Scaffold this active site. Structure first.
Site, PDB file in Angstrom:
ATOM      1  N   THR A  85       0.805  -1.223   0.000  1.00  9.02           N
ATOM      2  CA  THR A  85       0.000   0.000   0.000  1.00  9.02           C
ATOM      3  C   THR A  85       0.825   1.253   0.000  1.00  9.02           C
ATOM      4  O   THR A  85       0.661   2.094  -0.882  1.00  9.02           O
ATOM      5  CB  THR A  85      -0.958   0.066   1.199  1.00  9.02           C
ATOM      6  OG1 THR A  85      -0.205  -0.019   2.417  1.00  9.02           O
ATOM      7  CG2 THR A  85      -1.952  -1.049   1.129  1.00  9.02           C
ATOM      8  N   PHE A 108      -8.462   5.280   3.756  1.00  4.42           N
ATOM      9  CA  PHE A 108      -8.125   4.345   4.828  1.00  4.42           C
ATOM     10  C   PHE A 108      -9.337   3.614   5.378  1.00  4.42           C
ATOM     11  O   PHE A 108      -9.286   3.067   6.478  1.00  4.42           O
ATOM     12  CB  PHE A 108      -7.409   5.077   5.957  1.00  4.42           C
ATOM     13  CG  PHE A 108      -6.079   5.637   5.555  1.00  4.42           C
ATOM     14  CD1 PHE A 108      -4.993   4.803   5.397  1.00  4.42           C
ATOM     15  CD2 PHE A 108      -5.922   6.993   5.319  1.00  4.42           C
ATOM     16  CE1 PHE A 108      -3.754   5.303   5.027  1.00  4.42           C
ATOM     17  CE2 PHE A 108      -4.695   7.501   4.938  1.00  4.42           C
ATOM     18  CZ  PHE A 108      -3.605   6.651   4.787  1.00  4.42           C
ATOM     19  N   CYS A 156      -8.119   1.672   8.585  1.00  2.34           N
ATOM     20  CA  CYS A 156      -6.736   1.228   8.584  1.00  2.34           C
ATOM     21  C   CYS A 156      -6.045   1.529   9.900  1.00  2.34           C
ATOM     22  O   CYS A 156      -5.880   2.693  10.268  1.00  2.34           O
ATOM     23  CB  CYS A 156      -5.965   1.928   7.474  1.00  2.34           C
ATOM     24  SG  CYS A 156      -4.246   1.397   7.366  1.00  2.34           S
TER      25      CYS A 156
HETATM   26  C1  HEM Z   1      -1.032   4.322   2.145  1.00  2.00           C
HETATM   27  C2  HEM Z   1      -1.040   3.237   2.909  1.00  2.00           C
HETATM   28  C3  HEM Z   1      -2.253   2.475   3.259  1.00  2.00           C
HETATM   29  C4  HEM Z   1      -3.523   2.500   2.764  1.00  2.00           C
HETATM   30  C5  HEM Z   1      -4.069   3.316   1.617  1.00  2.00           C
HETATM   31  C6  HEM Z   1      -4.274   1.580   3.541  1.00  2.00           C
HETATM   32  C7  HEM Z   1      -5.637   1.343   3.339  1.00  2.00           C
HETATM   33  C8  HEM Z   1      -6.411   0.529   4.144  1.00  2.00           C
HETATM   34  C9  HEM Z   1      -7.804   0.356   3.981  1.00  2.00           C
HETATM   35  C10 HEM Z   1      -8.628   1.012   2.905  1.00  2.00           C
HETATM   36  C11 HEM Z   1      -8.235  -0.516   4.941  1.00  2.00           C
HETATM   37  C12 HEM Z   1      -9.661  -1.002   5.150  1.00  2.00           C
HETATM   38  C13 HEM Z   1      -9.874  -2.378   4.525  1.00  2.00           C
HETATM   39  C14 HEM Z   1     -11.307  -2.839   4.488  1.00  2.00           C
HETATM   40  O1  HEM Z   1     -12.251  -2.097   4.837  1.00  2.00           O
HETATM   41  O2  HEM Z   1     -11.562  -4.008   4.103  1.00  2.00           O
HETATM   42  C15 HEM Z   1      -7.087  -0.868   5.712  1.00  2.00           C
HETATM   43  C16 HEM Z   1      -7.105  -1.739   6.768  1.00  2.00           C
HETATM   44  C17 HEM Z   1      -5.941  -2.097   7.427  1.00  2.00           C
HETATM   45  N1  HEM Z   1      -4.683  -1.658   7.193  1.00  2.00           N
HETATM   46 FE1  HEM Z   1      -4.120  -0.358   5.891  1.00  2.00          FE
HETATM   47  N2  HEM Z   1      -3.493   1.038   4.475  1.00  2.00           N
HETATM   48  C18 HEM Z   1      -2.260   1.506   4.371  1.00  2.00           C
HETATM   49  C19 HEM Z   1      -1.127   1.198   5.135  1.00  2.00           C
HETATM   50  C20 HEM Z   1      -1.105   0.254   6.156  1.00  2.00           C
HETATM   51  C21 HEM Z   1       0.031  -0.094   6.917  1.00  2.00           C
HETATM   52  C22 HEM Z   1       1.421   0.484   6.752  1.00  2.00           C
HETATM   53  C23 HEM Z   1      -0.376  -1.078   7.805  1.00  2.00           C
HETATM   54  C24 HEM Z   1       0.381  -1.801   8.854  1.00  2.00           C
HETATM   55  C25 HEM Z   1       1.662  -1.626   9.140  1.00  2.00           C
HETATM   56  C26 HEM Z   1      -1.766  -1.301   7.584  1.00  2.00           C
HETATM   57  C27 HEM Z   1      -2.537  -2.205   8.281  1.00  2.00           C
HETATM   58  C28 HEM Z   1      -3.911  -2.324   8.084  1.00  2.00           C
HETATM   59  C29 HEM Z   1      -4.700  -3.238   8.922  1.00  2.00           C
HETATM   60  C30 HEM Z   1      -4.209  -4.165  10.021  1.00  2.00           C
HETATM   61  C31 HEM Z   1      -5.968  -3.100   8.514  1.00  2.00           C
HETATM   62  C32 HEM Z   1      -7.161  -3.838   9.092  1.00  2.00           C
HETATM   63  C33 HEM Z   1      -7.654  -3.020  10.303  1.00  2.00           C
HETATM   64  C34 HEM Z   1      -8.836  -3.645  11.007  1.00  2.00           C
HETATM   65  O3  HEM Z   1      -9.852  -3.990  10.374  1.00  2.00           O
HETATM   66  O4  HEM Z   1      -8.825  -3.822  12.242  1.00  2.00           O
HETATM   67  N3  HEM Z   1      -2.169  -0.485   6.574  1.00  2.00           N
HETATM   68  N4  HEM Z   1      -5.977  -0.239   5.187  1.00  2.00           N
END
Ligand code: HEM
Ligand code: HEM
Ligand SMILES: O=C(O)[C@H](Cc1c[nH]c2ccccc12)NC(=O)C(F)(F)C(F)(F)C(F)(F)C(F)(F)C(F)(F)C(F)(F)F
Lengths: 453, 453
Positions: free
Chosen positions: A266, A391, A398
């Protein structure tokens, strides 16, 4: 309302439309033609794609809709397990891990990760300083080297040493191939057809490789007793305030696999798109570079200085507006409900939020939606509710948002302080789709400003 | 009494004895059996291999014997041209380049190269510092990355960036394959046989890769007019006091190719053997490490401090004693003469000096010649003239001696300052022969002493 629906293929309904290497971009064009909502059917299955802020603001009501695992996520779950990203909200390990890991991902925790982020960022800057006269930079490739390394180091004190290699790490080969196979499963009548036996065998192999290698990282850490201030330590030691329980080692593995997926996929895309837009918009590059030079007055940037890169922050948000690197999320209706006064939904009915289209809603942003203008983000309070969702939403948003933005701001700041950039090929945007979006083949030249590190 | 000679193969005489991966080691074994001199015959040629200090001291009388181009060197000349290493003493360009370049290779000149040597040395140390707990080091591979890059940067301000890749720089791939072909040509009875058509096509392609890069670098420097701290600058501006002429662009290219060959092949070998002997002799390692820690008190070593690493220097000389990395040099009789009061030679007769055998002459070194004991070099006054010749002889001695020894002393000092070393595989010495000798498959583990850079 007799909901719009794209072209069908007899008994296959809409499924053949996703038989393409760029399905999200195909869906965006369908949204352009059909509007704020369209139904999408395949044999035995239906979802509705939402593209307007009008409808998406209802979809974001957590009392009415919860996170759904899309078919892609259900396949990613075969290797990401019940980590945070591939768990249902109602699974015990979701709220447990959520509660335990929030403190690890706060703006406060970024202060602790900052030094290790700088370590990788400086490796990037040094690579580019050391290129010879006529040489160029492979942008997504180098951004992925950086973001993978950053999460390995900050996450579990492990050095992937991506800037020392061309060959990807064994874990990554399997991870990428697993991710690929998870997306490819989405175009197969008769999965039990022996024509997929090799695909299945390879997938099981890949699953076992990631497990064995991460389980060993856990084991080794328990064995050493070391208390490095990182995600692994916090997971080994932390207790959920609600249940009073810690995460078990299997779930810890799944969280680590999840964080590696995120850090590879991402944030690297975000940095790549941001640089793309900066080189395509020289006035904006100049304003960003001005701030970087003004703010980053020390050879090593400090946490506080990264917080002061406000325009760099706006640049990243605008890059997230146009090309949110994880472009769609899925929801299901918690009860029977009516969407937008016109579309009755039953309990369990699914929605897909098409983020790039939401971000192109002219009723919200004005007619210049395709233009790159970071200034749109000068005041969060002038942006309507639920207009900007790179996010995701609510309690399932996120967890890595603060981490991603800190890393990206730091690195982009350093990049703009240390180099001038040339779009020497007049690069034509070509977006590759994996779990995420990236600008494939994006290359630039970087002329050093000769500022010491 | 007849001169000893090894076993023969009919019409091919002794030639098949060199049909082996390890010809020099084969010749050392023969020397051990046959003594201080043996004849070696092939179809249409003869040479005499010398192993004793008593015969070699005479061979090194420059009034009686001059440097000969061995068969191998004649083939290397297809790409190294009339560079210093592959030119005859009587060719105009030898003395001309020698006069011009000697000041660029002096002990004083090393003050100017020191900072760029440090640049690469620090990259080596950072690479090892960044290894994960139980990963290992591939010793000759990393030493070769280092020494190639050092001469690239010091030689013509070009960064091969070998620590950023697994796969060698294209130029190096070509150089290695050309060097390999040059050694392989030696055994072919019918070189124009169609079975070698591809070998020859590839050789020509490899020569062109080398000429193209080097000629471009020369052209680019002349165009820009920039003045760096490198050999290229000195060669572009230098004038030979004798002829009053500068080197022309073609000869400059051959010199650069020559320097790259030397850096890649020789110094890396020395460093690899030194580390080998160190991990096999921990008392010596301890003694050298003490000196490194005592002397190298600053994060960035200084020229002055490198000069104080006396024992590290002794370690290197003892490694050069047992395994001189360019192990044999060739001479010819300038006129009719008698060698050793015993073996009459005609004008033109060729001699080969087996350096490893000279360095095992029990009559000079004592009976413990196979033992690694740097204390042998505690007082240089003690070493008899012509007993120790890892850098060859007289006016055709290695011009890069001070460069090689400065680099190796710096790097070994930093290695011993920053890490403890484990021979974790109980490595069995296996010596690969290219242009030079190197310990193939030598691996170690390095545990950081956590001393900042
Ligand atoms: C520009 C960077 C990033 C973007 C655009 C992004 C985007 C997202 C999005 C859209 C979701 C929601 C997914 C859903 O609704 O199904 C999400 C969930 C998540 N992201 Fe990211 N993310 C990024 C970076 C990161 C990083 C660096 C990490 C960890 C080191 C991370 C860990 C997670 C986790 C664990 C979730 C699930 C959270 C939960 O439901 O409890 N993300 N991310
Ligand atoms: C441990 C490192 C090295 C060893 C053991 C070594 C050994 C030798 C030896 C034995 C010769 C004499 C060859 C003959 O008689 O045919 C020689 C010549 C030469 N070496 Fe090296 N060398 C080393 C490093 C270097 C380096 C780093 C350079 C250049 C950057 C270099 C450049 C040369 C040149 C140009 C000659 C030809 C000198 C002349 O005849 O004018 N060497 N070397
Ligand atoms: O996996 C799913 O459930 C949905 C929709 C879908 C896929 N196959 C279907 C059959 C019938 C009805 C719906 C579908 N897949 C997609 O929308 C998609 F096209 F694959 C997609 F857009 F790439 C995606 F997977 F959703 C996505 F957008 F890339 C994503 F969800 F963001 C990603 F996580 F990146 F995969």
């Amino acid at each position: 309302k007799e909901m719009p629906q794209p072209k069908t293929f007899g008994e296959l309904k809409n499924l053949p439309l996703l038989n393409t290497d760029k399905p999200v971009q195909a869906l965006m064009k369908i949204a352009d033609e059909l509007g704020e909502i369209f139904k999408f059917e395949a044999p035995g299955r239906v979802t509705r794609y939402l593209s307007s802020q009008r409808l998406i603001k209802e979809a974001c009501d957590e009392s009415r809709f919860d996170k759904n695992l899309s078919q892609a996520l259900k396949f990613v779950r075969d290797f990401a397990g019940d980590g945070l990203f591939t768990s249902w909200t109602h699974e015990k390990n979701w709220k447990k891990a959520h509660n335990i890991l929030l403190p690890s991902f706060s703006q406060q925790a970024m202060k602790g990760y900052h030094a290790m982020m700088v370590d990788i960022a400086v490796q990037l800057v040094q690579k580019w300083e050391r290129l010879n006269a006529d040489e160029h930079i492979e942008v997504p490739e180098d951004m992925t080297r950086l973001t993978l390394d950053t999460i390995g180091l900050c996450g579990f004190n492990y050095r992937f040493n991506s800037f020392y290699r061309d060959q990807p790490h064994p874990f990554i080969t399997s991870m990428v191939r697993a991710l690929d196979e998870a997306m490819n499963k989405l175009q197969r009548a008769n999965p039990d057809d022996p024509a997929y036996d090799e695909n299945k065998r390879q997938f099981q192999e890949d699953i076992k490789v990631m497990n064995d290698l991460v389980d060993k990282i856990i084991a080794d850490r328990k064995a050493s007793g070391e208390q490095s201030d990182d995600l692994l330590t916090h997971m080994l030691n932390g207790k959920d305030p609600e249940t009073g329980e810690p995460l078990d080692d299997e779930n810890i593995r799944y969280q680590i696999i999840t964080f590696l997926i995120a850090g590879h996929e991402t944030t690297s895309g975000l940095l790549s798109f941001a640089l793309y837009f900066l080189v395509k918009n020289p006035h904006v590059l100049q304003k960003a570079a001005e701030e970087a030079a003004r703010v980053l007055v020390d050879p090593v940037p400090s946490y506080k200085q990264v917080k002061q890169l406000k325009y760099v922050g706006m640049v990243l948000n605008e890059a997230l507006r146009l090309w949110p690197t994880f472009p769609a999320f899925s929801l299901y209706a918690k009860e029977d409900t009516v969407l937008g006064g016109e579309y009755p939904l039953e309990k369990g009915d699914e929605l897909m939020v098409l983020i790039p289209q939401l971000h192109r809603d002219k009723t919200i942003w004005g007619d210049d939606v395709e233009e790159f203008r970071p200034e749109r983000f000068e005041n969060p309070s002038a942006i309507p509710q639920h207009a900007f969702k790179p996010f995701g939403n609510g309690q399932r948003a996120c967890i890595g948002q603060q981490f991603a933005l800190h890393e990206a701001t730091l690195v982009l700041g350093m990049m703009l302080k240390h180099f001038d950039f040339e779009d020497h090929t007049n690069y034509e945007l070509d977006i590759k789709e994996t779990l995420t979006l990236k600008p494939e083949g994006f290359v630039v030249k970087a002329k050093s400003k000769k500022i010491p590190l």
